[PDB]
Every structure is written in structure tokens, then in C-alpha cells.
DNA sequence: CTGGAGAATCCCGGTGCCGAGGCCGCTCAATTGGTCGTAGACAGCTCTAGCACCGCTTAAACGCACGTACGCGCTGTCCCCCGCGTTTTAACCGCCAAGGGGATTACTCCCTAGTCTCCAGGCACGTGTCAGATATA
DNA sequence: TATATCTGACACGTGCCTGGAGACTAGGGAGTAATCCCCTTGGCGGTTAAAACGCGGGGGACAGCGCGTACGTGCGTTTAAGCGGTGCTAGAGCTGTCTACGACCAATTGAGCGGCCTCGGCACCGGGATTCTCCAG
């Protein structure tokens, strides 16, 4: 028989897992290349402290996570568990970003 | 150290000169570093005590930023004083909404 | 930094307890944070009364302005006690 | 010239951060738009940060630069001195 | 007719959003301020302009709260504000 | 003084909502708004009186409330 | 006035003195206040321009805080730079909601 | 008592000569100048401090302006300030 | 209505290590001891705005009947995001290799505070006037 | 509304003084040069974790629709808030002391910093019991 988990057990279990851990999530070097790519528009062939870029990744994801908390609350009130783009627009709007 | 003369621990001298070398005001009253350093030592003792307690609550003897995470975020007064502050490698407080959990 | 002082406090509060370097750095950043908060707000507080000296009066009032309730109260207790003890010497 | 390295930050990585962020279910359109939101947020910060670097006329961005930038927007980060 | 629901509301919104004069009764506001102020010192001495500035900041803060609350409602496919919605807004505001 | 939080009546609150652009208001809104406004103002009176008592003054000046609002990141203009 | 010597209006001497004795550092460079007053006077020029347009277009001859209010709320940059500001006696702009 | 009324009125006569001003609007504008004053002076102080400089020059002000104003308004501010400073110190 | 297998997790235990905590020289910054000039503590007093009460005016609050319009639940649809298997590369790390600009020391300077004087710009302060209110024919 | 009379808030005028401009000295912040190196960049090369892809498919987003309560609004009721007016006085602000305190310089010296141990908390690991879950009952 196909060993299959129900929609949510592994997902929430993974949520709990990363709620226990404290390390950075996404891939590092492609992200650093994105950093240099965006950085091209100001000066070409820039030197970067790797740890500063790591700090950028940490603070950026902390920001993203906080946004996920707020849009998550928006989903909670709107009878959803699914985040939508307009919810992000609401959250950033209330924050004052547009 | 003037702290030891007062029976304290934070360096009144370094902070005090940082007040002169920090461009905040033209002159600094004598009681200001004593009073201020006292406030930092007390609040510091609060932070270390909560971090120590939280470290013991996790079968660890060494305090790591995760202990700063649950200790600070489980303290209302630090959460309110640091509502715009997120520290490095702190992570997230575990909290899953009831409507998200399965209904066993 | 502030490592040696935080470790002294560690020996006073939890002697059988260690701390990571990263957390000690967090503590150093917090010390600098609180320092600019009190120094800036106390500085403008002194400016409001057009005073050029920040004394115990201004620091005390500034602490009650900046610090929330119970922590401020105990800060006044420990602070005022401490200033009394060192100033009488 | 490198292009679309923001697509290097992939869909499951977004699922990683979002799942640590407390998200349980994710619309398919969330991923690219969220990459755009992240890009916007970074540009709000990285431009000002590199502007701090350019004031010193240096070619190496220091950690202090990102400290001052994050502090400037009230998104203080501890852990660097 | 009986002045249909919404027309009088929208015109009233236009009129008072079109104007700028103060809208809260002065004596209840001032006495309320002094009454709450009693919990530190009874019988405060106040500048009238101070009372007016508190009325200004207060009403701007409340109106802004209605703006964010209303946007949360409209986003939430509603047009009727609820207290829990306000609590949600302030939580999103960080209160 | 007693019960002056109800002196800022519900019609005045409606005037705010019209100035805020609101069409329908729950009946429980008014008291919750009085609570939020209450805590908010308590914050204003607290630090404001701290400035007044600090200067050994009996009268609250306008500049003090300006400083208080500025501390709370909501700058108020209108005083030269 | 040195402003007129530079072809400006805001007081170079007063701004220069208050900035030097602004308690940030004992010494302040000479061109910084001129640059400062130039930028602020420029800012003054666009806001007085938008306000003038507002009074003229609203059949008014004296500028009041209301014209400042919709002046700011109609200018994206003024809204951005003054995002933490509360305008005394200004009211709000009637931004009309879609459902309303 | 110091104020900025007269200069704002002269600039008003420079932009819209046929437009007048209420006293309250002049006062609130003076408060606005006080705000801009505090923001720029504070940020410039921070900028000079971060690299430990004890003199505020035109470069620190320029960089600070570039930090506070997003894009074209900063471009016109730097343009006008640069023209003003250059033109003044060159005559 | 609930237990059975088995993946996930807890726990027990064993291994290695490198980061953490403790030691050891080595300065220089914190402390003292005065000194100098002044910010500010101090006492008494004006006036004036805040307070406080009287009295007239009416704007504003309150209550009720009514209807609708708004929230909300039931019920129904369906497609899209979760789950899992599969392939693929390109992420990760260790290593190799070059070298720039950051950090340091020192040189050289030119730029701003401080003194002192001087005076017209800038502040306070009435005066005209025109935008606009009022009466009668 | 003509005409004629009547007002008030702001434009325009005045007198007085005090804050900024000149020019100089003096000391020191900043640009500049040179120079070492260490971390930064960029390559090779092996291993494999992980993204991509795709195939179900149950379930969550969403619509329709129907029910019902409650909040708005008109209209009539009721009134204390607001203005003016009168009168008082605490205390903001002023005026006049007068100095002990905080900055400063120089001299002192031990705390605190950088480099260097070395060992055990914790990561990693492997193995068995328990727990939790999905899918059977």
C-alpha cells in the first residue's frame, strides 16, 4: 500500500522543526549572486564582505517572516489558510509601504 | 573601578567618558553615570537571569541566542520595549493557531 | 566589548551557566542600544530646560520617561540607593 | 551579465521561510510576487546601505553599513558590535 | 422620502471630510483629561492650546484608525467594522 | 469628576467615523474605542505630567505635549 | 543678508549659527548651512507653489492648513517624507473608497 | 523672538505674488521647518559620527539628503543646493 | 466506536572537537587632586492667564419606531495546492591561486573657534485699508 | 440691489537693539603617499542534497442563496455646553544674587585588552524505547 501522509502532518511538523532550529533557510551563493546582480546598478565589480551579505539574508528573512505573520493574521480573519497577493498588499499598505 | 567603590559591576569610567566622547550634552552631572550604570546593571541582571532560567529549562548550560529568543519573547516587558528589534539567529517563537492545527 | 562584565554578572546570577559568543555580541549591541536611547532622549530632555548639564534629576526623569513600569520603579530603587551609597563616600 | 538570480531563490525555499513564518497553505502566485516584495524591500535598504558605503568611497561594503541601514528604518539587528 | 441608507452617510462623510473644525465637545474633553490626570496629580493647570492640541492629535489618531480599520474590513470583504477587527488592526499596528 | 469617558458621546464618535469615512459601526465599537483612546491618552498624560513635574511647574505647557508626541513618533505641527 | 549674496532668502547667518551651536559638534563646515538653507528654501518653494495652486484653484486668497493637507495628500513625495506627521487643523483628504 | 515668517512670505511673493497667507498656516509651516531642521540635523550628526568626523561639511549634508529624499526630489535638492553653494562661493 | 505498524521522535549512550573559558604579559585609560569660571541654585515678586462662579443662548445629546442592508451559515462546486516519486545539477565544501584596497604610520596643510568691535537687519509695535457686514429706500 | 455706513484681520509703517560679518591666530582633522596582507574573488574538482517535474486527488477558496438581527436615520424630546462677563489669585516668568561643581591638565597605575592554551558541552552519531499518526478496524 502507498505510504502517504495526510495534507498537513509533514508540513506542520516541518514548521515545528524550523521553529526549533535557528539557521538560515535558502541557498546562499545564488542569493549572493542576486545581491551582486542588484548591486551592479550602483558600481560594477564590487567587493562584498560575505558575513555582511549573510546579515542581509538574516534581517531580510526576519522581515519576510514578520510579513508572513501579519498576512497570516489576514488569512485567519478572511476564513483562509492560503495567503493571497492582495493580502500582502493589505499588510504592506497598513504598515505604510505604499 | 568606581563601581567597586560603590559595590557595583558596570564600568562607570568607560561609559562616563563615552558620554563626554559621544556629543550628547555639553556637561555631565556627577550622579548620572552612577544612576545610569545602576539601571543597566539591574536590567542586565534581569536579562541574564531570564536567559539562565531558560537555558536550564532546555537541558543546556551554555546560553545561545535561541535562549534569548524564548526568554525575551516570552517576557512581555522586553517584547514591548523591543517591539521593533529582532536579533541575529534568534528564530521565531513557537505558536501555531488553533484553526491551523487538526482537531483531535 | 562588555564580555568580562556580563560574565561577572553571570557569576553573580547563575554561576554554573555558560553563554555563546553570539549571545554576548547580542548583549553588547543591546548595551550600545540602551546607551544611545538614554543619551539622546536625556540629551533633548536637558535641552528642553535649556540646561547644559545632565544630572541625576534629568537621568531619573528620563528613566521614568523611557522605561516601562516595574523595571523603572526598581531602577529608581537600585539607582537612588546606589547614588546615595557612592555619593555619601 | 547575470539575470534572474532571484529565481534562484526557489519555490521550496519560499515554502521554507513561509513555513517558518507560520504559513500553512501557499497560493502558486505567492512565490514570484513575494520575490518581488523581497526585491522591493531590499532596494529600500541595500541602496541606502551602499549609499553609506559610497560616502566612504570604498569598494568593500562593511557590516557597519548594513547596521546603520537597518537601524535607519527601525529594523534594528543585534549581533555585530 | 425617508432619506435612503448610504446617501446621507456619503454626503455627511464628504462634508466633514471636506471641513477641518474640531468635532469633540470641549468641556467633556477637558474634564475627562483632568479626571484621568488626577491619577498623578489632582487639579492640573492647563493651557487651552494644549487641550486643543490633544484634541487635534487625538482625532487624527482616531480617524487614521478608522482608515486602517475600514481598509481591513473592505479587504476582508466586509463594510462593517467590529471591535475584534480594531484589535486586529492595533495588533498589526503593534499595540 | 466621574464617568467623563462617556461625555465624549457616541454621536461625536459618529462624527469621527464620518470624518474617518465609515458607513456602518458595530454597537460595541464605541466603548472599545473609548478604551483605546483611554490608554493612548493615559500615555500622553503620564509622560506630559512627567515633563511638567520635572521642571517644577504646575502648568502643562504646549511644548511639553509636543515633546511627548514626538517621543511617540507622531509629530504634531502648528506652533511656529 | 548672505542669502541675497547667494541669491536666496532663508537666513544664512541665523541657520549657520544655530547649526554650529546646535550641539552636534563644536565645528561645522562653512558650505553645509548654505547647502541646507538652499534645500529647505527649495522645499519651501514647491510647497508654497502647491499651496498657491490649491488656494487659486479653490477660489481662495489666503492659504490655510486645509490646502496644506490636500497639498501633501496629493503629493506622493510629500506623503512619503511626512509619513510620521500629524497636521494640526488640517482635516483629511476625502479619499473615496470604491465601495463607498 | 525668532521666527521664519518673513522669509516664507518673501518666497510666497516670489512664487505666487497674488496669493496671501493666514497666520496659522505660516505658524504650522514654521513648525514644519522645525521638523525638517531636526531630521536633517540629527541624521547629519549621525552620519558624521559613524565615520567619526567632527566637522559637518557639504558632503555629509548631501549624502544625508540622498538618504532622506527618494529620487527626483533629492536630485532637485542636490542640484539647487550645489548651484547655490557653487555660485555663492564662486563670486 | 478504537487499536496496530511504523515513521518520527525521545532517550540512552558514545565519539570528537573546536569553541569557550581560563591564563598570561602588556600597556593607557580610569582615577585622583587640585584649579578655574560659570551654570545654575536660590529668594522674592508681578501679572496674567488660569481658575471660578453668574447668567443667558441653543447646539447638541437622547429616545423610539421603522426598514434595510449587512453578516453569516448552509449548501454546493471544483480546481489547485499538498503528498510523494523521479531526475538532474548545481549547491556545498575543500582546495588552489592572485592580489586590491583596507588599515596603519606619517606629512602637510588649511580651516574653524575664539576676541573684539560695529551696525543694520530683525524684532516689537500701531495704523490704514479693503473684504465684507448692515440698513433703508 | 444702490448707496451708504460700519467692522476687523492683515498689509504696511515705525523705533530700538543685538546678533552676525571682518580679520586674525592657533591648533589639528583630513587628504595624501606608501606599504603589508588578508580577506576577497575567482577558478578546479568531487559528492550529493535538493530543486524540478509530474501525477493523483482531497479539501479549501469561493459562490449562491436564504435567513434575521441590528444599526442607521428621521423626527420629536431634553438639555448642559458654550459664550460673555465678573472677579480672584497661584505661579510663570522675571530679577537679583552667588557659589560649589564640572571641565581641565597633569600625574598615577592597575584594570582591561590581545594572544595563547586545552578540554568538555554539545554536535554528531548509532541504536533501542517510546510516542504519535494514518490507516486500518
Automatic annotation (TrEMBL), chain B:
It comes from the Eukaryota. GO terms for molecular function: DNA binding; protein heterodimerization activity; structural constituent of chromatin. Residues 1-73 form the Core Histone H2A/H2B/H3 domain. The keyword Acetylation applies. GO terms for cellular component: nucleosome; nucleus. Keywords: Acetylation, Chromosome, DNA-binding, Isopeptide bond, Nucleosome core, Nucleus, Phosphoprotein, Ubl conjugation. Residues 76-104 form the Histone H2A C-terminal domain. The keyword Ubl conjugation applies. Its main location: nucleus. It is found in: Chromosome; Nucleus. One of its GO terms (biological process) is heterochromatin formation. Core component of nucleosome. Nucleosomes wrap and compact DNA into chromatin, limiting DNA accessibility to the cellular machineries which require DNA as a template. Histones thereby play a central role in transcription regulation, DNA repair, DNA replication and chromosomal stability. DNA accessibility is regulated via a complex set of post-translational modifications of histones, also called histone code, and nucleosome remodeling. The nucleosome is a histone octamer containing two molecules each of H2A, H2B, H3 and H4 assembled in one H3-H4 heterotetramer and two H2A-H2B heterodimers. The octamer wraps approximately 147 bp of DNA. Belongs to the histone H2A family. This is Histone H2A. It comes from Xenopus laevis (African clawed frog). The chain holds residues 17 to 120 of 130 of the full protein.
